[PDB]
Amino acid sequence: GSSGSSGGPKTVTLKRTSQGFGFTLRHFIVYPPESAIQFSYKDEENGNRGGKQRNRLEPMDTIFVKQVKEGGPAFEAGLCTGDRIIKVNGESVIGKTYSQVIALIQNSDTTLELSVMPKDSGPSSG
Numbered sequence: 001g002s003s004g005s006s007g008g009p010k011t012v013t014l015k016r017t018s019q020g021f022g023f024t025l026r027h028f029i030v031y032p033p034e035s036a037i038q039f040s041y042k043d044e045e046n047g048n049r050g051g052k053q054r055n056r057l058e059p060m061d062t063i064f065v066k067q068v069k070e071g072g073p074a075f076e077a078g079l080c081t082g083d084r085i086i087k088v089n090g091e092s093v094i095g096k097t098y099s100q101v102i103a104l105i106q107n108s109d110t111t112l113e114l115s116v117m118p119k120d121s122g123p124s125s126g
Contacts, residue, residue, distance in 0.1 A: 012077035014112040022072020029059045087115035
């Protein structure tokens with residue numbers, strides 16, 4: 001018997017340990033301006049607000065995992081590499097940005113719940 005979940009959303013719980021949670025994400029697809037470069041040299045840059053007229057076609061596809069510590073929370077939860085994030089802290093992060101889910105992971109308080117989507121797999125039949 002047994003199976004790698006036959007239909008349904010995957011859920012993984014993590015416990016706040018050493019700030020991090022074993023696994024990690026990948027830096028957000030930078031969104032630098034094509035032509036500009038005329039604002040300070042070494043300092044933050046305005047992000048929020050701007051102008052609801054054109055709006056650059058930003059990427060923001062998915063979070064996607066990077067690595068999974070060896071002997072951490074995620075590792076236990078059953079996380080891995082390549083697993084894409086769909087939900088976070090029972091919070092719908094569909095239209096949310098990586099900068100959002102991040103806070104969620106940081107606002108995990110005690111534990112940090114996540115959710116991915118396992119693909120069809122089966123090395124053995126049984």
